[PDB]
Design a protein around this nucleic acid. Structure first.
Lengths: 219, 328, 594
DNA sequence: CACCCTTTCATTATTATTATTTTTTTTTTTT
C-alpha cells in the first residue's frame, strides 16, 4: 500500500538514542494488545513480530521489517530534562528505629548504593514524527489507537500522543530506505547517510545481544 | 484506567531546576556580565508547544512539578499511610534492597540483572503495590503512569486539553521569593543572651573578627571559606493555583486502584515541594475523577467501594515475603 | 443509501457523513458538535436526526429561532415516521396577542379587516398558520404574525398577551391548553428562549418534558445569548414613571443612579452608596400599591419591574446600565455573568444533543471555547469534523485593493474608505453591502457618501432598524437601481440576502453582487458572559470571537450553490500588514484566490 | 562469602540563557 504515518504530540518526548523505528512502536503496541487479549503471563517474544507490515528479505538471509525510521520535524527547540533518584534517608532512619527496617549500616552513601542520589539528563523534543512503511492502514490504526505514548513509555508523563494519521502515498516519494539495513542490502537501497555499524535491525532495538553488523541511517 | 486529581496548593510550589540562574535585586533573570547578580533556583519549567496566539506552534515556558516527584509522592504516601502500618501490625522486617526497591526505584537488591520468568512477571505485576511501579533488578514496567502536576494555565492548553477553559489562569505564575540567613552571633544582645555560649563574649567577639577578616579579605580579593550571612532567591509557583494530575493505569487490578484511592484519601498530610522547612507544597484535594466520573468529597473519598474492599483485603494479606521475593 | 435514516433521501449527499456520525454519537448519549455551512440544508439533516431518534421511542426536542421554525416543520411534514409519532410546537406568550386590546385598537384606528378578523375567533389567515395548525392538530388563533399581516403598524408590545391578562380572554386559555402540547407528540419544537425559560423553571424548583432524551438545537451559536437574554431581569424607569402617574423614591434612585464611557460594567455590588436603600424603597413602594382599580396592562409593567428589582436585591447577579437609542432613558439590568449552573442543569436533563450552527467551531476541529460558552461537559462533548464545501468559496472573487488608512474612527479614513466604496459601487453590477461595527463610523461614511451617491444608499442608525433597511434593499433592487447598504449589527449575522423571486435559478442571483468589509469586527460582543470569559481567556477569546463574527459577515455572500460573479472586498489595512494578531483573518482569506 | 569501611585513581577546561499593546456595540421576542 506504501503509506506514511505522522504522530503529533500533546507532551514533549525523549529524543531517541539512535533511531525510533515504527515497527518497534507497533511491536510494543501489539505486545500491549496481547497483554489485554490474553493476560499478563505471556512471552513478549511471541507477539511483537505479529505486525501488519511487509517483511523485506535481503539477498542472503538477514530479513527486516518494511518500515522506515521516524523522521523528526522539530516544532520546538531541543531542550533537556533532568531527573534524580534518592531514597529518603529520614524515613529510613525512623524505620530502622521502629524495627520495620533491618539495616546494619549506620551511614548512607550518596555516591553509590541504595541511598545513592543520582542525577541524569535526557534530551527533550516536541516534534512531528513522520515514518514511511508498506502495510495495511487499518491494522496500524488499530494498533496506534492504544498508543498513548511514544518514544518513551516512561510512566512518568512523556511523549503523550495528541494524535496520529496514516495516508497512502506514491512509490517514488516514499524513502523506505532510511532505516537500519543489513550490509548485504540492495545497491539501490543503500544511501549516503547510511554507514556500517553495530545496530539492531529488528524487534527489540534495545537488546544488544540481537545487535548485528548493519548499515543504518543517522537521525 | 485514568484518575485525574485536581488540587489547589494551599502553600507555594517549589521544585528546583538545574543550571546556574542569576537574578538581579530588581528582578531581571540572567543578566549580561558586568552587573551585580544573584543566585536563583527557579522552579522546574519545561518549554512546551503553544497554539495560543497563531495557528503556528510557539515554544512557551510552563512551570510544573516533574512527574517523578508525583510518582515518588504517591509511592511514599502509600508506604507511609497504609503499607507501613499494615507491615508493622504484623511484625514484618524489610531488608535493604527490598526496602530500597519498595521505597526507591533502585536495583540494590541484586545489582546483577535478575532474570524474570513470565509467570513471575505476571505474579508481581498483579501485586497491589509492587506492580504499580516495579523497579529493582527485574526492571519490569510498572502499571502506573504518573504524569507531571500541570497547573491549569494557558501555556499548558495543549497539555491540559479542552474542558479546563473554565477556572483557568494566565500570565505569570512564578514569584521570586527572597530568603536569607543572618549570622546570629550579630543578633546577640547582652550577657544574659550570651551566657549559654562556651566562651560567651570572647567566643562571640572571636567569630565577629573572623567574619570581618574573611569579608574584608574577600572584598580585597574582589578588587575559600564562606560565612553564615546569605541572601538568595528562588522562584516558586503561586499558592492557590489549581493543578491537574493524570494517573493512567495500564490494565490495573481492583486492589491497585484501591491503593491509589487510599493514597488520595490520606495525601492531604503530604507535601510537594523543595520547601519542607517553609511548609511549601501543602495542598487540599478538590476533585478526583475515576474514568471521567468525579469521586472526591469533602469527607475523603465517597465511591468505589469495590476498590476499597479490594485494597482492604489486599493490605491485610501481605506478609512482606513477596517484597523480599520481588527484590531477589 | 442502504440502511438509511428516516428522511435521509431528501438530505444532500455532502451532509450524509455529518448526519451519520451525529446520529451515532447521539445514540451513545454524547452532546454532538455538528458544523455545516448555510446552503447545505441543515434543516433536512436535523429532520433526519429528529426522525431517527423519534422512532427509538425518544422524546425529541428541537430548539430553533422562530424564523427557522417554518422550514423546520416544512422538513417535518411528509416523512412517515414523524407522521406516526407526531410533531408539535411549543410557543410562548409573545407568539399571541390580546384580543380585547387589539379590537380596541382596531376600532380606534378604523381597521376593518383586523376588527372583522378578531370578531369571529381570530381565525388563521397566513398559509403558515393554518398549515402549522394542521400539523400540530391544535388550532392556532390570535397569532401575532396573523394580526401583523393585516396591519403592519400595530403596537405589538402594547397589544401583547401578558401574564396579567384575564382568564376569560380566548388567547390565554389557548396558550394554557397548548402548554400541554408535549404530551401528545413525540417531537416538540421550541425556541431557544422557551428552552432557557423552562430550564429556569426547572432550576427554581410544564411546557416541555422533564427529561429530554434527544435535543437538537438549530443555530446553536445564538442559544447561549438566549440564556443570557433569559437571566437578565431589567428595570425600565420611564414606563414605570408614566404608569404611576396614570414615587419620589424612584426619582431619588435616578438621582443616586446618576452619580455612578463605562458606567458600572460587570459590578454586582462593588459600589452601593444609596443603591440598596433606594432599591428597598422601590420594592416596598411598588409591591404595596393596590391591585384593585389598577389597570390590567399596567400590572404587567409593575410585575416585571418588581421581578427585576427582586433579581437586583439578592446580590448573586451583576448590575449593568444602558440607555435607549431613542433618548437617554434610565435602563438598569440585573443579569448573570456566570452560567454554569443553569445550563449544566439543562445538560443532565438532556440524554443526547446535536448542536448545529453556521459558526460553531474555532479552527479546524477546535471547538473548546464553544463548550466554554454553553458550559458543555467535556465527558459528554463530541467534536465532529465540519463540512466546508468548495461551492461556498467557488464563485466569490477576492480583490487585492483596499483602503490604506487604518480604521481609527477618523474623518480621513472615512474619506479614503468612502472613495473605495465609490469605486466598488461604480464597478457593482448589483447590490452592495458595506459592513461596519459602530454607529459613529457608519455616520462618518454616510456623511462622506451622501451627496456622492444620492438615492442609492441605505444607512442604519438609531431610527433605522435592520428589518427596515433589508426591506428597502429588496425594494430598490426590485426597482432596478443598484443599492449600497451601510450595514451594522444584525447586518453582520443573520440576514438572508438571497432573493426569493428566483428560487429555481440561482445563476441569475445578483441581489448582492458586492460584500465589502470596512473593518475587522473586534470588540463586538459586550455581553456580561463574554466579558467574564474574555477576562479569563484574554486576547485569544477576543480574536476568536472576532473571527466568528467575521465568518458570519462573510457568510452573507453565498447562501446557495449555483450563483456566479460574486465579489468580496476587505479594506482593513491591518489585514494586509505585517501584524501577527490578524493571522487567522488571513487564513480564512487564504480560502479565496485571485 | 554476605555485610560494610575506606582507601584509591583520573585529565582536560568554559560559562549562553526566548516572555503583551481591544471597542465601546442596542441585539432579542422569557417570566
Amino acid at each position: 500500500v506504501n503509506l506514511k504515518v505522522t504522530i503529533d504530540l500533546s507532551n514533549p518526548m525523549m529524543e531517541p538514542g539512535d533511531l525510533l523505528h515504527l515497527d518497534a512502536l507497533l511491536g510494543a503496541l501489539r505486545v500491549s494488545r496481547a497483554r489485554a487479549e490474553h493476560g499478563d503471563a505471556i512471552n513478549p517474544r511471541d507477539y511483537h513480530y505479529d505486525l501488519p507490515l511487509e517483511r523485506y528479505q535481503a539477498p542472503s538471509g538477514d530479513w527486516v521489517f518494511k518500515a522506515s525510521a521516524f523522521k523528526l520535524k522539530r516544532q520546538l527547540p531541543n531542550q533537556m530534562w533532568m531527573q534524580t533518584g534518592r531514597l529518603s534517608i529520614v524515613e529510613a532512619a525512623r524505620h530502622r528505629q521502629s524495627g520495620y527496617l533491618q539495616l546494619r549500616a549506620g551511614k548512607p552513601n550518596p555516591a553509590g548504593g541504595p541511598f545513592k542520589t543520582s542525577i541524569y539528563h535526557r534530551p527533550i523534543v516536541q516534534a512531528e514524527l513522520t515514518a514511511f512503511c508498506v502495510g495495511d492502514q487499518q491494522g496500524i490504526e488499530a494498533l496506534l489507537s492504544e498508543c498513548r505514548q511514544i518514544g518513551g513509555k516512561r510512566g512518568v508523563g512523556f511523549g503523550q500522543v495528541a494524535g496520529f494519521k496514516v495516508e497512502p502515498v506514491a512509490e517514488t516519494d516514499c524513502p523506505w530506505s532510511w532505516r537500519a539495513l543489513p550490509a548485504d542490502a540492495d545497491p539501490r537501497l543503500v544511501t549516503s547517510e547510511h554507514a556500517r555499524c553495530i545496530a539492531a535491525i529488528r524487534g527489540p532495538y534495545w537488546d544488544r545481544t540481537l545487535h548485528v553488523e548493519a548499515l543504518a541511517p543517522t537521525p | 484506567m485514568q484518575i485525574e486529581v485536581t488540587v489547589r496548593n494551599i502553600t507555594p510550589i517549589f521544585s528546583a531546576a538545574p543550571g546556574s540562574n542569576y537574578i538581579t535585586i530588581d528582578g531581571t533573570i540572567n543578566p549580561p556580565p558586568g552587573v551585580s547578580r544573584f543566585p536563583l533556583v527557579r522552579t522546574r519549567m519545561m518549554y512546551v508547544a503553544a497554539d495560543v496566539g497563531d495557528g503556528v506552534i510557539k515554544s512557551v515556558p510552563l512551570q510544573i512539578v516533574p512527574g517523578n516527584t508525583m510518582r515518588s509522592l504517591l509511592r511514599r504516601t502509600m508506604l507511609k499511610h497504609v503499607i507501613e502500618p499494615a507491615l508493622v501490625e504484623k511484625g514484618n522486617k524489610l531488608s535493604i534492597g527490598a526496602y530500597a526497591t519498595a521505597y526507591s526505584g533502585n536495583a540494590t537488591g541484586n545489582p546483577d540483572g535478575v532474570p524474570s520468568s513470565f509467570d513471575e512477571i505476571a505474579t508481581m505485576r498483579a501485586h497491589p503495590f509492587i506492580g504499580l511501579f516495579g523497579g529493582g533488578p527485574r526492571m519490569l514496567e510498572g502499571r502506573l503512569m504518573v504524569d507531571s502536576l500541570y497547573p491549569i494555565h494557558t501555556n499548558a492548553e495543549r497539555i491540559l486539553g479542552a474542558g479546563y477553559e473554565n477556572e483557568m489562569m494566565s500570565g505569570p505564575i512564578t514569584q521570586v521569593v527572597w530568603a536569607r540567613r543572618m549570622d546570629p552571633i550579630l543578633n546577640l544582645g547582652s550577657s544574659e543572651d550570651v551566657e549559654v555560649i562556651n566562651g560567651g563574649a570572647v567566643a562571640a567577639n572571636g567569630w565577629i573578627q573572623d567574619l570581618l577578616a574573611n569579608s574584608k579579605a574577600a572584598a580585597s580579593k574582589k578588587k575559600n571559606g564562606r560565612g553564615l550571612k546569605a541572601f538568595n532567591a528562588h522562584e516558586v509557583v503561586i499558592p492557590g493555583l489549581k493543578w491537574v494530575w493524570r494517573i493512567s493505569l495500564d490494565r490495573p487490578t481492583d486492589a491497585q486502584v484501591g491503593l491509589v484511592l487510599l493514597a488520595l484519601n490520606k495525601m492531604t498530610n503530604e507535601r510537594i515541594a523543595g520547601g519542607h522547612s517553609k511548609d511549601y507544597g501543602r495542598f487540599v484535594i478538590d476533585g478526583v475523577s475515576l474514568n471521567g466520573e468525579q469521586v472526591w468529597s469533602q469527607s475523603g473519598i465517597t465511591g468505589g467501594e469495590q476498590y476499597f474492599d479490594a485494597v482492604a483485603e489486599a493490605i491485610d494479606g501481605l506478609s512482606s515475603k513477596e517484597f523480599e521475593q520481588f527484590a531477589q | 443509501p442502504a440502511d438509511a435514516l428516516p428522511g435521509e433521501g431528501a438530505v444532500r449527499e455532502v451532509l450524509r457523513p455529518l448526519l451519520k456520525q451525529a446520529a451515532e454519537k447521539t445514540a451513545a448519549g454524547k452532546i454532538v458538535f455538528a458544523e455545516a455551512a448555510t446552503g447545505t440544508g441543515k434543516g433536512r439533516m436535523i429532520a433526519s436526526l429528529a426522525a431517527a431518534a423519534a422512532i427509538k421511542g425518544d422524546t425529541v426536542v428541537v430548539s430553533a429561532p422562530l424564523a427557522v421554525t417554518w422550514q423546520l416543520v416544512n422538513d417535518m411534514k411528509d416523512i412517515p415516521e414523524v407522521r406516526r409519532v407526531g410533531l408539535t410546537l411549543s410557543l410562548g406568550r409573545p407568539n399571541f396577542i390580546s384580543p380585547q386590546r387589539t379590537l380596541e385598537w382596531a376600532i380606534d384606528n378604523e381597521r376593518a379587516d383586523l376588527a372583522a378578523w378578531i370578531e369571529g375567533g381570530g381565525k388563521p389567515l397566513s398559509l403558515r398558520s393554518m398549515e402549522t395548525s394542521k400539523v400540530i392538530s391544535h388550532e392556532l388563533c390570535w397569532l401575532l404574525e396573523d394580526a401583523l399581516l393585516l396591519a403592519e403598524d400595530l403596537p405589538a408590545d402594547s397589544l401583547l398577551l401578558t401574564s396579567e391578562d384575564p382568564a376569560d380572554c380566548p388567547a390565554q386559555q389557548l396558550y394554557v391548553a397548548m402548554r400541554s402540547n408535549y404530551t401528545e407528540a413525540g417531537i416538540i419544537l421550541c425556541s431557544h428562549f422557551m428552552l432557557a425559560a423552562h430550564t429556569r423553571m426547572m432550576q427554581m424548583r410544564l411546557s416541555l418534558p422533564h427529561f429530554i432524551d434527544t435535543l437538537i438545537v438549530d443555530e446553536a451559536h445564538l442559544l447561549e445569548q438566549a440564556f443570557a437574554s433569559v437571566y437578565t431581569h431589567t428595570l425600565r424607569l420611564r414606563p414605570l414613571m408614566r404608569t404611576i402617574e396614570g414615587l419620589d423614591a424612584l426619582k431619588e434612585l435616578f438621582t443616586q443612579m446618576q452619580v455612578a464611557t463605562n458606567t458600572s460594567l460587570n459590578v454586582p455590588l462593588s459600589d452601593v452608596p444609596e443603591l440598596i436603600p433606594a432599591l428597598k424603597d422601590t420594592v416596598k413602594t411598588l409591591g404595596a400599591l393596590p391591585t384593585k382599580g389598577m389597570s390590567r396592562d399596567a400590572r404587567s409593567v409593575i410585575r416585571i419591574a418588581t421581578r427585576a428589582a427582586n433579581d437586583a436585591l439578592s446580590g448573586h447577579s451583576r448590575l449593568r446600565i444602558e440607555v435607549t437609542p431613542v433618548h437617554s432613558y434610565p435602563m438598569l439590568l440585573s443579569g448573570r455573568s456566570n452560567l454554569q449552573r443553569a445550563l449544566l442543569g439543562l445538560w443532565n436533563a438532556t440524554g443526547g444533543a446535536t448542536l448545529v450552527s453556521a459558526t460553531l467551531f474555532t479552527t479546524g476541529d477546535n471547538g473548546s471555547l464553544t463548550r466554554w460558552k454553553l458550559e458543555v461537559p467535556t465527558e459528554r462533548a463530541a467534536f465532529l469534523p465540519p463540512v466546508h464545501p468548495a461551492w461556498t468559496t467557488a464563485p466569490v472573487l477576492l480583490h487585492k485593493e483596499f483602503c490604506a488608512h487604518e480604521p481609527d474612527d477618523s474623518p480621513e479614513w472615512a474619506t479614503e474608505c468612502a472613495q473605495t466604496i465609490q469605486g466598488v459601487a461604480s464597478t457593482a453590477q448589483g447590490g452592495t453591502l458595506v459592513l461596519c461595527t459602530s454607529y459613529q463610523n457608519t455616520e462618518l461614511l454616510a456623511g462622506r457618501l451622501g451627496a456622492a451617491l444620492g438615492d442609492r444608499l441605505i444607512v442604519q442608525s438609531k431610527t433605522s432598524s435592520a428589518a427596515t433597511c433589508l426591506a428597502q434593499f429588496k425594494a430598490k433592487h426590485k426597482a432596478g437601481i443598484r443599492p449600497v447598504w451601510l450595514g451594522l449589527g444584525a447586518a453582520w449575522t443573520g440576514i438572508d440576502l438571497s432573493d426569493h423571486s428566483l428560487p429555481d435559478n440561482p445563476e441569475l442571483d445578483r441581489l448582492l453582487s458586492d460584500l465589502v468589509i470596512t473593518r475587522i469586527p473586534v470588540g463586538q460582543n459586550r455581553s456580561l458572559t463574554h466579558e467574564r470569559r474574555t477576562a479569563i481567556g484574554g486576547f485569544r477569546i477576543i480574536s476568536q470571537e472576532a473571527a466568528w463574527h467575521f465568518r458570519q459577515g462573510l457568510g452573507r455572500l453565498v447562501r446557495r450553490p449555483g450563483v456566479t460573479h460574486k465579489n468580496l472586498w476587505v479594506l482593513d489595512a491591518r489585514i494586509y500588514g505585517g501584524a501577527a494578531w490578524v493571522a487567522p483573518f488571513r487564513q480564512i482569506l487564504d480560502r479565496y484566490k485571485k
